[PDB]
Design an enzyme around this catalytic site. Sequence first.
Site, mmCIF file in Angstrom:
data_model
loop_
_atom_site.group_PDB
_atom_site.id
_atom_site.type_symbol
_atom_site.label_atom_id
_atom_site.label_comp_id
_atom_site.label_asym_id
_atom_site.label_seq_id
_atom_site.Cartn_x
_atom_site.Cartn_y
_atom_site.Cartn_z
ATOM 1 C CB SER A 1 1.178 -10.086 6.343
ATOM 2 O OG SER A 1 -0.051 -9.607 5.036
ATOM 3 N N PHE A 2 2.387 -7.331 3.846
ATOM 4 C CA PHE A 2 2.186 -5.746 3.358
ATOM 5 C C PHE A 2 0.555 -5.737 2.935
ATOM 6 C CB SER B 1 -1.760 -4.328 -2.434
ATOM 7 O OG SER B 1 -3.600 -5.556 -2.805
ATOM 8 C CB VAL B 2 -2.770 -0.914 1.372
ATOM 9 C CG1 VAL B 2 -3.091 1.080 1.720
ATOM 10 C CG2 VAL B 2 -3.903 -1.387 1.616
ATOM 11 C CG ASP C 1 -10.697 -9.579 6.956
ATOM 12 O OD1 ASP C 1 -10.318 -10.216 8.389
ATOM 13 O OD2 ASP C 1 -9.748 -9.145 7.011
ATOM 14 C CB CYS D 1 -0.225 1.119 4.554
ATOM 15 S SG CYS D 1 -0.023 3.034 3.178
ATOM 16 N N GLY D 2 1.160 -1.964 4.838
ATOM 17 C CA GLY D 2 0.925 -3.114 5.774
ATOM 18 C C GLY D 2 2.502 -3.528 6.708
ATOM 19 N N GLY D 3 3.047 -2.819 6.620
ATOM 20 C CA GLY D 3 4.035 -4.055 7.333
ATOM 21 C C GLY D 3 4.182 -5.070 7.240
HETATM 22 C C1 LIG Z 1 0.072 2.709 8.435
HETATM 23 O O1 LIG Z 1 -1.149 2.221 8.104
HETATM 24 C C2 LIG Z 1 -2.039 3.356 7.461
HETATM 25 N N1 LIG Z 1 -1.711 4.560 7.848
HETATM 26 N N2 LIG Z 1 -2.788 5.372 7.850
HETATM 27 C C3 LIG Z 1 -3.732 5.067 7.187
HETATM 28 N N3 LIG Z 1 -4.434 5.550 7.106
HETATM 29 C C4 LIG Z 1 -5.645 4.859 6.111
HETATM 30 C C5 LIG Z 1 -4.793 3.214 5.433
HETATM 31 C C6 LIG Z 1 -6.372 2.015 4.345
HETATM 32 C C7 LIG Z 1 -6.872 2.291 3.611
HETATM 33 N N4 LIG Z 1 -7.062 1.075 3.109
HETATM 34 C C8 LIG Z 1 -7.700 1.438 1.635
HETATM 35 C C9 LIG Z 1 -8.050 1.367 0.861
HETATM 36 F F1 LIG Z 1 -6.543 2.270 0.354
HETATM 37 C C10 LIG Z 1 -9.407 1.434 -0.314
HETATM 38 C C11 LIG Z 1 -9.885 0.777 0.018
HETATM 39 C C12 LIG Z 1 -9.757 0.088 1.794
HETATM 40 N N5 LIG Z 1 -11.361 -0.230 1.917
HETATM 41 S S1 LIG Z 1 -12.454 -0.651 1.457
HETATM 42 O O2 LIG Z 1 -13.279 -2.016 1.739
HETATM 43 O O3 LIG Z 1 -12.031 -1.472 -0.378
HETATM 44 C C13 LIG Z 1 -13.620 0.513 0.680
HETATM 45 C C14 LIG Z 1 -13.414 1.945 1.746
HETATM 46 C C15 LIG Z 1 -14.282 2.795 0.906
HETATM 47 C C16 LIG Z 1 -15.260 2.762 -0.254
HETATM 48 C C17 LIG Z 1 -14.895 1.642 -0.834
HETATM 49 BR BR1 LIG Z 1 -15.861 1.246 -3.036
HETATM 50 C C18 LIG Z 1 -14.019 0.619 -0.399
HETATM 51 C C19 LIG Z 1 -8.912 0.559 2.602
HETATM 52 F F2 LIG Z 1 -9.781 0.407 3.438
HETATM 53 N N6 LIG Z 1 -6.433 0.260 3.752
HETATM 54 N N7 LIG Z 1 -5.856 0.968 4.412
HETATM 55 C C20 LIG Z 1 -3.980 2.903 6.071
HETATM 56 C C21 LIG Z 1 -3.195 3.410 7.057
#
Ligand SMILES: COc1n[nH]c2ncc(-c3cn(-c4c(F)ccc(NS(=O)(=O)c5cccc(Br)c5)c4F)nn3)cc12
EC number: 2.7.11.25
Length: 297
Positions: A19-20, A22-23, A126, A15-17
Amino acid sequence: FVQIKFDDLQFFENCGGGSFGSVYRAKWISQDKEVAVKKLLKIEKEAEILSVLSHRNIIQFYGVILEPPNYGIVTEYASLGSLYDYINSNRSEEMDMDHIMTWATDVAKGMHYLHMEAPVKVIHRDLKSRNVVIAADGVLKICDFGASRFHNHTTHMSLVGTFPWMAPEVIQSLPVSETCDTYSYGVVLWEMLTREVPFKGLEGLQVAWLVVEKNERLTIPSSCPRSFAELLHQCWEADAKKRPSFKQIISILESMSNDTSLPDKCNSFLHNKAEWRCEIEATLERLKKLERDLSFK
Ligand SMILES: COc1n[nH]c2ncc(-c3cn(-c4c(F)ccc(NS(=O)(=O)c5cccc(Br)c5)c4F)nn3)cc12
């Protein structure tokens, strides 16, 4: 602390595009739900304590993967993507006052929850537009609010690209209160108002020096409504103790929506970017000229 099996997750694009990180977007198969999955080196007890946070303007915890070497945190997936991508795309030209008021309030209410309503006090440190996502109905949800707790330190590499949103005391590694998040929220509001990348193309450490040493702040176009300009200035105060809480920002935004003259003034401003984008670009040019001077030393 729901456990999800790595094999119960069908993976998709990161999902990062740029600086991707690890999501990943994924499908939780057994639950027939679209999810986000943050891959992690290891799950720590902080993930357990933050796993109980729940608010409409924060990303919703679903579970954790606890199968070495696969660790991660699973959350909801916001259908409409990141706030940053929206703002920096042609779609954001549809924004008007009502849209901004609602989204400014979304982030403020999420940060209020993190600061004052959660069982544990969360200071994001952040907050930025790439850390806010847009659900299917337009509700904004803050992401990554635990990262400043997961890691206890920073490096120049991990800060690259984030300096525009960081409060001066955070840049300086000085004492930090929750109003560091107020400063970052001001940048996100400015992003929505101007639909520009803050300090675009500038060396992060020049930004840091300008904000920290010189009290430099993002250019507010002269025709920006005074109620927004004033709120930005309050968020951006050098002295963190003079910035408003998120409870106060919420009451300020509410009062601005009783102002009958603000919508026309704000909508005219919002749709007039062809005329005032030059004010923002002039300051960028000056800072780029300043950088050339500071290169010869
Ligand atoms: C195109 O990109 C997107 N389009 N739509 C999206 N929807 C969602 C996201 C998304 C979710 N996360 C994510 C995650 F997967 C896990 C943890 C965190 N934040 S945290 O602080 O570690 C936290 C949160 C809750 C419980 C706890 Br315990 C810890 C987190 F943010 N990151 N990105 C990205 C996109």
